[PDB]
Amino acid sequence: VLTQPPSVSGSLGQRVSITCSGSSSNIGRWGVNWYQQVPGSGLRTIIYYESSRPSGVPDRFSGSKSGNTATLTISSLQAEDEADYFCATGDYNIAVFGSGTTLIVMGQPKSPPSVTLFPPSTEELNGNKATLVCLISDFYPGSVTVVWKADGSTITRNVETTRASKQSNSKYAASSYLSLTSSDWKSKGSYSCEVTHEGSTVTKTVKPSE
Amino acid sequence: QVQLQESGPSLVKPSQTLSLTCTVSGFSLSSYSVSWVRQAPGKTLEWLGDASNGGIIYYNPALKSRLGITRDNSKSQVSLSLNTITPEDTATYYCAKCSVGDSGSYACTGRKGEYVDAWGQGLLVTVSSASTTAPKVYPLSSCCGDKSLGCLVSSYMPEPVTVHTFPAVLQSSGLYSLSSMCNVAHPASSTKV
């Protein structure tokens, strides 16, 4: 396996580069290719051999090789470059890949988390089960913490929360669920989804009266 | 244009055989090599094997005892079978079109002009004993008084599902659930809503 830095950071417009370290039997012997992978999507080849660009790949992307290390450079970082990057070549009898680098775009301003907390439905309670859905949208950075309350008391019973995601606006999103029974939702008077974000709580609450 | 489509069961039980087919179009397998690679969740890429335009099959020696790859130019298909699977074989499986009939190295690398010029979309195959479950979907509204819609595709298996949609969560029930900011589509369950 070729070694790549786990992450590289830069702000918009900066020059950033990503290295790929191997040996004389791979990077030292063969050309080196690079693949771009946007989170959730597939793969795209952006550089091959030395610094060749497939059609459609802008000239901001370039590559070079020095000894047993290959370097992928973005001369001016843009927002659509936030993705993972993998180097690729061959060894004696196998294909080898780099361990991958997440390219992080830093220097962004903060945004408040939009929380539309929803109660379950009449079909769910007729099948005696309650699914509280706490959706969180548009915040930077992505390190929010959600604490559920039942009339003002901590809850860790049946709490699953997707970690910080990334849609398409250079921000982060997350969803949290409360998979409790029918009586458990009808018992208490009010449940709340308390979301923390850099020292800011945006609590929402619907009570079973409606 | 050029297109590569991965097909096969996306949920296989451990110890069974995982089989996939890549059907290609827009180009002839007599002209270009085709590679299979996979990416386990949150991990890097792993090479499975290559199938050159001359019928030569190159394997990852770490997987050769379980791996078989076949190439049918007449049907424009390159297939893979992987037996004796375990959850370590859960991955997104990609086929890929090489720019040449046979590259100097493996997985379409090596010499000048040799690169993957078209990637498949990938097919996530989950290795698990769970049963294929079509999701129970409901609407999500907040009609409880305010001074001011989402979907509830819950309890399905396996991933993925297609619909601001959120990534799914793995509840303790062993099933997946997600929501969106309604048309949901679970290809493994064959159901549409």
mmCIF file of N, CA, C and O in Angstrom, chain A residues 33-105:
data_model
loop_
_atom_site.group_PDB
_atom_site.id
_atom_site.type_symbol
_atom_site.label_atom_id
_atom_site.label_comp_id
_atom_site.label_asym_id
_atom_site.label_seq_id
_atom_site.Cartn_x
_atom_site.Cartn_y
_atom_site.Cartn_z
ATOM 1 N N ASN A 33 -1.136 7.318 -11.386
ATOM 2 C CA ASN A 33 -2.438 7.884 -11.702
ATOM 3 C C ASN A 33 -3.134 8.350 -10.430
ATOM 4 O O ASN A 33 -2.847 7.876 -9.326
ATOM 5 N N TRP A 34 -4.069 9.281 -10.598
ATOM 6 C CA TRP A 34 -4.821 9.821 -9.473
ATOM 7 C C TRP A 34 -6.317 9.749 -9.738
ATOM 8 O O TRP A 34 -6.776 10.064 -10.843
ATOM 9 N N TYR A 35 -7.077 9.352 -8.714
ATOM 10 C CA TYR A 35 -8.530 9.261 -8.786
ATOM 11 C C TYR A 35 -9.155 10.234 -7.799
ATOM 12 O O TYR A 35 -8.717 10.334 -6.648
ATOM 13 N N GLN A 36 -10.193 10.932 -8.247
ATOM 14 C CA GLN A 36 -10.991 11.801 -7.393
ATOM 15 C C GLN A 36 -12.301 11.107 -7.040
ATOM 16 O O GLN A 36 -12.930 10.479 -7.899
ATOM 17 N N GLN A 37 -12.705 11.214 -5.771
ATOM 18 C CA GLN A 37 -13.949 10.603 -5.303
ATOM 19 C C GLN A 37 -14.661 11.579 -4.377
ATOM 20 O O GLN A 37 -14.224 11.794 -3.242
ATOM 21 N N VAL A 38 -15.752 12.162 -4.858
ATOM 22 C CA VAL A 38 -16.574 13.035 -4.011
ATOM 23 C C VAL A 38 -17.382 12.173 -3.051
ATOM 24 O O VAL A 38 -17.866 11.103 -3.456
ATOM 25 N N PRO A 39 -17.526 12.559 -1.782
ATOM 26 C CA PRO A 39 -18.244 11.703 -0.826
ATOM 27 C C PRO A 39 -19.637 11.330 -1.312
ATOM 28 O O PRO A 39 -20.431 12.185 -1.709
ATOM 29 N N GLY A 40 -19.924 10.028 -1.286
ATOM 30 C CA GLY A 40 -21.181 9.496 -1.755
ATOM 31 C C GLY A 40 -21.210 9.115 -3.219
ATOM 32 O O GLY A 40 -22.052 8.302 -3.616
ATOM 33 N N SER A 41 -20.313 9.668 -4.031
ATOM 34 C CA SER A 41 -20.293 9.432 -5.463
ATOM 35 C C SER A 41 -19.215 8.404 -5.817
ATOM 36 O O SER A 41 -18.588 7.795 -4.944
ATOM 37 N N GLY A 42 -18.993 8.207 -7.116
ATOM 38 C CA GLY A 42 -18.041 7.222 -7.596
ATOM 39 C C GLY A 42 -16.642 7.769 -7.797
ATOM 40 O O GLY A 42 -16.198 8.633 -7.038
ATOM 41 N N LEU A 43 -15.939 7.282 -8.820
ATOM 42 C CA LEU A 43 -14.547 7.630 -9.067
ATOM 43 C C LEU A 43 -14.386 8.351 -10.400
ATOM 44 O O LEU A 43 -15.169 8.144 -11.331
ATOM 45 N N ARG A 44 -13.342 9.178 -10.484
ATOM 46 C CA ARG A 44 -12.964 9.868 -11.715
ATOM 47 C C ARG A 44 -11.447 9.955 -11.789
ATOM 48 O O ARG A 44 -10.806 10.349 -10.809
ATOM 49 N N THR A 45 -10.876 9.603 -12.943
ATOM 50 C CA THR A 45 -9.433 9.748 -13.126
ATOM 51 C C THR A 45 -9.101 11.181 -13.531
ATOM 52 O O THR A 45 -9.630 11.689 -14.522
ATOM 53 N N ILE A 46 -8.204 11.824 -12.783
ATOM 54 C CA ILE A 46 -7.871 13.217 -13.029
ATOM 55 C C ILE A 46 -6.452 13.414 -13.558
ATOM 56 O O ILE A 46 -6.206 14.383 -14.288
ATOM 57 N N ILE A 47 -5.516 12.532 -13.227
ATOM 58 C CA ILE A 47 -4.128 12.652 -13.668
ATOM 59 C C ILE A 47 -3.622 11.256 -13.987
ATOM 60 O O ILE A 47 -3.951 10.299 -13.275
ATOM 61 N N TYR A 48 -2.824 11.123 -15.047
ATOM 62 C CA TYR A 48 -2.226 9.825 -15.327
ATOM 63 C C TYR A 48 -0.805 9.943 -15.858
ATOM 64 O O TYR A 48 -0.430 10.928 -16.501
ATOM 65 N N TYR A 49 -0.042 8.874 -15.602
ATOM 66 C CA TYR A 49 1.367 8.694 -15.931
ATOM 67 C C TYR A 49 2.222 9.692 -15.164
ATOM 68 O O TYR A 49 2.788 9.359 -14.117
ATOM 69 N N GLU A 50 2.319 10.918 -15.678
ATOM 70 C CA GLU A 50 3.017 11.997 -14.983
ATOM 71 C C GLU A 50 2.058 13.151 -14.722
ATOM 72 O O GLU A 50 1.605 13.313 -13.588
ATOM 73 N N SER A 51 1.693 13.936 -15.742
ATOM 74 C CA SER A 51 0.785 15.055 -15.528
ATOM 75 C C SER A 51 -0.261 15.151 -16.635
ATOM 76 O O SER A 51 -0.717 16.252 -16.964
ATOM 77 N N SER A 52 -0.665 14.020 -17.215
ATOM 78 C CA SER A 52 -1.674 14.031 -18.263
ATOM 79 C C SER A 52 -3.066 14.184 -17.666
ATOM 80 O O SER A 52 -3.389 13.584 -16.632
ATOM 81 N N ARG A 53 -3.898 14.980 -18.332
ATOM 82 C CA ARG A 53 -5.259 15.216 -17.872
ATOM 83 C C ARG A 53 -6.253 14.620 -18.849
ATOM 84 O O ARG A 53 -6.228 14.982 -20.037
ATOM 85 N N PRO A 54 -7.137 13.720 -18.412
ATOM 86 C CA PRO A 54 -8.239 13.301 -19.284
ATOM 87 C C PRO A 54 -9.136 14.482 -19.622
ATOM 88 O O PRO A 54 -9.157 15.502 -18.927
ATOM 89 N N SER A 55 -9.893 14.327 -20.706
ATOM 90 C CA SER A 55 -10.766 15.395 -21.177
ATOM 91 C C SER A 55 -11.750 15.811 -20.089
ATOM 92 O O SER A 55 -12.293 14.972 -19.363
ATOM 93 N N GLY A 56 -11.962 17.121 -19.970
ATOM 94 C CA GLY A 56 -12.848 17.677 -18.971
ATOM 95 C C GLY A 56 -12.198 18.034 -17.651
ATOM 96 O O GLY A 56 -12.842 18.695 -16.828
ATOM 97 N N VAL A 57 -10.954 17.631 -17.424
ATOM 98 C CA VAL A 57 -10.274 17.862 -16.150
ATOM 99 C C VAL A 57 -9.504 19.180 -16.254
ATOM 100 O O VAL A 57 -8.615 19.294 -17.110
ATOM 101 N N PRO A 58 -9.793 20.170 -15.408
ATOM 102 C CA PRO A 58 -9.186 21.498 -15.586
ATOM 103 C C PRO A 58 -7.698 21.507 -15.262
ATOM 104 O O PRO A 58 -7.189 20.682 -14.501
ATOM 105 N N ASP A 59 -6.992 22.483 -15.852
ATOM 106 C CA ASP A 59 -5.539 22.527 -15.732
ATOM 107 C C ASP A 59 -5.065 22.967 -14.356
ATOM 108 O O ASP A 59 -3.851 23.014 -14.129
ATOM 109 N N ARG A 60 -5.982 23.295 -13.445
ATOM 110 C CA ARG A 60 -5.602 23.512 -12.055
ATOM 111 C C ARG A 60 -4.981 22.260 -11.444
ATOM 112 O O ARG A 60 -4.162 22.360 -10.521
ATOM 113 N N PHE A 61 -5.348 21.083 -11.946
ATOM 114 C CA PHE A 61 -4.789 19.817 -11.492
ATOM 115 C C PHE A 61 -3.538 19.471 -12.289
ATOM 116 O O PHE A 61 -3.559 19.467 -13.528
ATOM 117 N N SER A 62 -2.458 19.163 -11.575
ATOM 118 C CA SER A 62 -1.223 18.722 -12.204
ATOM 119 C C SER A 62 -0.547 17.707 -11.297
ATOM 120 O O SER A 62 -0.882 17.579 -10.118
ATOM 121 N N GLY A 63 0.407 16.973 -11.869
ATOM 122 C CA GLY A 63 1.126 15.964 -11.122
ATOM 123 C C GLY A 63 2.600 15.970 -11.470
ATOM 124 O O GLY A 63 3.016 16.475 -12.515
ATOM 125 N N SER A 64 3.388 15.403 -10.559
ATOM 126 C CA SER A 64 4.830 15.292 -10.720
ATOM 127 C C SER A 64 5.317 14.097 -9.914
ATOM 128 O O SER A 64 4.595 13.552 -9.070
ATOM 129 N N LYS A 65 6.553 13.682 -10.188
ATOM 130 C CA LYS A 65 7.161 12.551 -9.499
ATOM 131 C C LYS A 65 8.616 12.867 -9.186
ATOM 132 O O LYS A 65 9.337 13.405 -10.030
ATOM 133 N N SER A 66 9.042 12.534 -7.970
ATOM 134 C CA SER A 66 10.429 12.724 -7.554
ATOM 135 C C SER A 66 10.872 11.481 -6.798
ATOM 136 O O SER A 66 10.477 11.279 -5.645
ATOM 137 N N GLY A 67 11.688 10.653 -7.445
ATOM 138 C CA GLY A 67 12.170 9.429 -6.839
ATOM 139 C C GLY A 67 11.072 8.407 -6.648
ATOM 140 O O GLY A 67 10.540 7.863 -7.621
ATOM 141 N N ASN A 68 10.721 8.140 -5.390
ATOM 142 C CA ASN A 68 9.673 7.188 -5.046
ATOM 143 C C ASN A 68 8.424 7.874 -4.502
ATOM 144 O O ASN A 68 7.606 7.230 -3.839
ATOM 145 N N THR A 69 8.259 9.169 -4.767
ATOM 146 C CA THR A 69 7.102 9.922 -4.302
ATOM 147 C C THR A 69 6.455 10.626 -5.486
ATOM 148 O O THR A 69 7.149 11.236 -6.306
ATOM 149 N N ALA A 70 5.133 10.525 -5.582
ATOM 150 C CA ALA A 70 4.355 11.253 -6.572
ATOM 151 C C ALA A 70 3.533 12.320 -5.867
ATOM 152 O O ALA A 70 3.038 12.102 -4.758
ATOM 153 N N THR A 71 3.408 13.486 -6.494
ATOM 154 C CA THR A 71 2.697 14.597 -5.880
ATOM 155 C C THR A 71 1.615 15.103 -6.822
ATOM 156 O O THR A 71 1.870 15.353 -8.008
ATOM 157 N N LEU A 72 0.415 15.260 -6.281
ATOM 158 C CA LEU A 72 -0.722 15.831 -6.983
ATOM 159 C C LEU A 72 -0.922 17.253 -6.483
ATOM 160 O O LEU A 72 -1.147 17.457 -5.288
ATOM 161 N N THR A 73 -0.848 18.233 -7.382
ATOM 162 C CA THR A 73 -0.998 19.624 -6.987
ATOM 163 C C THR A 73 -2.275 20.227 -7.553
ATOM 164 O O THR A 73 -2.600 20.039 -8.731
ATOM 165 N N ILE A 74 -2.985 20.965 -6.709
ATOM 166 C CA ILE A 74 -4.011 21.899 -7.155
ATOM 167 C C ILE A 74 -3.421 23.295 -7.013
ATOM 168 O O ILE A 74 -3.081 23.722 -5.904
ATOM 169 N N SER A 75 -3.268 24.000 -8.138
ATOM 170 C CA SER A 75 -2.589 25.292 -8.115
ATOM 171 C C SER A 75 -3.446 26.381 -7.482
ATOM 172 O O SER A 75 -2.906 27.330 -6.900
ATOM 173 N N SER A 76 -4.768 26.275 -7.594
ATOM 174 C CA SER A 76 -5.697 27.212 -6.967
ATOM 175 C C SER A 76 -6.917 26.420 -6.522
ATOM 176 O O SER A 76 -7.711 25.980 -7.360
ATOM 177 N N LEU A 77 -7.069 26.247 -5.213
ATOM 178 C CA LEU A 77 -8.111 25.379 -4.683
ATOM 179 C C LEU A 77 -9.497 25.975 -4.909
ATOM 180 O O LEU A 77 -9.723 27.166 -4.687
ATOM 181 N N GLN A 78 -10.437 25.133 -5.338
ATOM 182 C CA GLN A 78 -11.825 25.536 -5.511
ATOM 183 C C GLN A 78 -12.744 24.623 -4.704
ATOM 184 O O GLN A 78 -12.351 23.539 -4.262
ATOM 185 N N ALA A 79 -13.983 25.084 -4.509
ATOM 186 C CA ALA A 79 -14.898 24.404 -3.594
ATOM 187 C C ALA A 79 -15.253 23.006 -4.088
ATOM 188 O O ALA A 79 -15.410 22.080 -3.284
ATOM 189 N N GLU A 80 -15.381 22.831 -5.404
ATOM 190 C CA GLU A 80 -15.697 21.525 -5.966
ATOM 191 C C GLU A 80 -14.529 20.548 -5.898
ATOM 192 O O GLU A 80 -14.683 19.402 -6.329
ATOM 193 N N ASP A 81 -13.373 20.964 -5.382
ATOM 194 C CA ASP A 81 -12.242 20.062 -5.210
ATOM 195 C C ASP A 81 -12.274 19.323 -3.878
ATOM 196 O O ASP A 81 -11.452 18.424 -3.666
ATOM 197 N N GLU A 82 -13.185 19.686 -2.979
ATOM 198 C CA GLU A 82 -13.315 19.002 -1.695
ATOM 199 C C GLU A 82 -13.787 17.573 -1.936
ATOM 200 O O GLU A 82 -14.955 17.339 -2.262
ATOM 201 N N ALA A 83 -12.875 16.620 -1.783
ATOM 202 C CA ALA A 83 -13.141 15.215 -2.073
ATOM 203 C C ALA A 83 -11.990 14.396 -1.505
ATOM 204 O O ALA A 83 -11.092 14.926 -0.839
ATOM 205 N N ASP A 84 -12.033 13.093 -1.758
ATOM 206 C CA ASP A 84 -10.936 12.191 -1.450
ATOM 207 C C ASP A 84 -10.140 11.921 -2.721
ATOM 208 O O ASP A 84 -10.686 11.913 -3.830
ATOM 209 N N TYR A 85 -8.845 11.689 -2.556
ATOM 210 C CA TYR A 85 -7.959 11.461 -3.688
ATOM 211 C C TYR A 85 -7.110 10.231 -3.414
ATOM 212 O O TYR A 85 -6.615 10.043 -2.298
ATOM 213 N N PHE A 86 -6.939 9.402 -4.439
ATOM 214 C CA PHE A 86 -6.201 8.152 -4.332
ATOM 215 C C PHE A 86 -5.178 8.080 -5.450
ATOM 216 O O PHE A 86 -5.519 8.311 -6.617
ATOM 217 N N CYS A 87 -3.945 7.718 -5.110
ATOM 218 C CA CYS A 87 -2.948 7.448 -6.136
ATOM 219 C C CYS A 87 -2.965 5.968 -6.491
ATOM 220 O O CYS A 87 -3.371 5.118 -5.691
ATOM 221 N N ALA A 88 -2.535 5.666 -7.713
ATOM 222 C CA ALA A 88 -2.600 4.303 -8.216
ATOM 223 C C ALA A 88 -1.429 4.022 -9.142
ATOM 224 O O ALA A 88 -1.054 4.863 -9.969
ATOM 225 N N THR A 89 -0.861 2.831 -8.992
ATOM 226 C CA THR A 89 0.206 2.352 -9.855
ATOM 227 C C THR A 89 0.252 0.829 -9.735
ATOM 228 O O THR A 89 -0.724 0.201 -9.302
ATOM 229 N N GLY A 90 1.373 0.235 -10.116
ATOM 230 C CA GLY A 90 1.522 -1.204 -10.056
ATOM 231 C C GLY A 90 2.817 -1.613 -9.391
ATOM 232 O O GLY A 90 3.831 -0.920 -9.467
ATOM 233 N N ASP A 91 2.761 -2.756 -8.715
ATOM 234 C CA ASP A 91 3.942 -3.432 -8.209
ATOM 235 C C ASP A 91 4.116 -4.748 -8.954
ATOM 236 O O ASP A 91 3.219 -5.197 -9.673
ATOM 237 N N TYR A 92 5.290 -5.359 -8.758
ATOM 238 C CA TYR A 92 5.758 -6.553 -9.464
ATOM 239 C C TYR A 92 4.652 -7.408 -10.075
ATOM 240 O O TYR A 92 4.664 -7.670 -11.282
ATOM 241 N N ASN A 93 3.685 -7.839 -9.260
ATOM 242 C CA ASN A 93 2.628 -8.723 -9.736
ATOM 243 C C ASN A 93 1.227 -8.270 -9.337
ATOM 244 O O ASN A 93 0.269 -9.025 -9.546
ATOM 245 N N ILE A 94 1.073 -7.073 -8.769
ATOM 246 C CA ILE A 94 -0.219 -6.591 -8.292
ATOM 247 C C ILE A 94 -0.387 -5.125 -8.670
ATOM 248 O O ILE A 94 0.564 -4.442 -9.055
ATOM 249 N N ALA A 95 -1.625 -4.648 -8.555
ATOM 250 C CA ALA A 95 -1.918 -3.222 -8.575
ATOM 251 C C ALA A 95 -1.905 -2.695 -7.148
ATOM 252 O O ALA A 95 -2.380 -3.365 -6.228
ATOM 253 N N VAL A 96 -1.364 -1.496 -6.956
ATOM 254 C CA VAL A 96 -1.311 -0.921 -5.617
ATOM 255 C C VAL A 96 -2.017 0.427 -5.621
ATOM 256 O O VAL A 96 -2.024 1.151 -6.624
ATOM 257 N N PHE A 97 -2.634 0.752 -4.484
ATOM 258 C CA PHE A 97 -3.325 2.022 -4.315
ATOM 259 C C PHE A 97 -2.818 2.740 -3.077
ATOM 260 O O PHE A 97 -2.423 2.114 -2.088
ATOM 261 N N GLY A 98 -2.859 4.067 -3.134
ATOM 262 C CA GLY A 98 -2.605 4.849 -1.943
ATOM 263 C C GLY A 98 -3.722 4.697 -0.931
ATOM 264 O O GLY A 98 -4.835 4.261 -1.249
ATOM 265 N N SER A 99 -3.406 5.052 0.322
ATOM 266 C CA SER A 99 -4.358 4.905 1.417
ATOM 267 C C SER A 99 -5.459 5.959 1.389
ATOM 268 O O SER A 99 -6.441 5.820 2.125
ATOM 269 N N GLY A 100 -5.330 6.985 0.555
ATOM 270 C CA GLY A 100 -6.372 7.983 0.401
ATOM 271 C C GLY A 100 -6.122 9.255 1.184
ATOM 272 O O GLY A 100 -5.602 9.212 2.302
ATOM 273 N N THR A 101 -6.483 10.399 0.604
ATOM 274 C CA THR A 101 -6.395 11.683 1.282
ATOM 275 C C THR A 101 -7.718 12.413 1.137
ATOM 276 O O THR A 101 -8.229 12.559 0.022
ATOM 277 N N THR A 102 -8.261 12.875 2.258
ATOM 278 C CA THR A 102 -9.415 13.764 2.261
ATOM 279 C C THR A 102 -8.931 15.203 2.139
ATOM 280 O O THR A 102 -8.177 15.687 2.990
ATOM 281 N N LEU A 103 -9.359 15.884 1.085
ATOM 282 C CA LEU A 103 -8.979 17.272 0.867
ATOM 283 C C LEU A 103 -10.024 18.173 1.509
ATOM 284 O O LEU A 103 -11.196 18.152 1.113
ATOM 285 N N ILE A 104 -9.601 18.960 2.494
ATOM 286 C CA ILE A 104 -10.499 19.757 3.320
ATOM 287 C C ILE A 104 -10.367 21.217 2.914
ATOM 288 O O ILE A 104 -9.251 21.743 2.823
ATOM 289 N N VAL A 105 -11.501 21.867 2.675
ATOM 290 C CA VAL A 105 -11.548 23.296 2.382
ATOM 291 C C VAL A 105 -11.838 24.024 3.689
ATOM 292 O O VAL A 105 -12.928 23.890 4.257
#
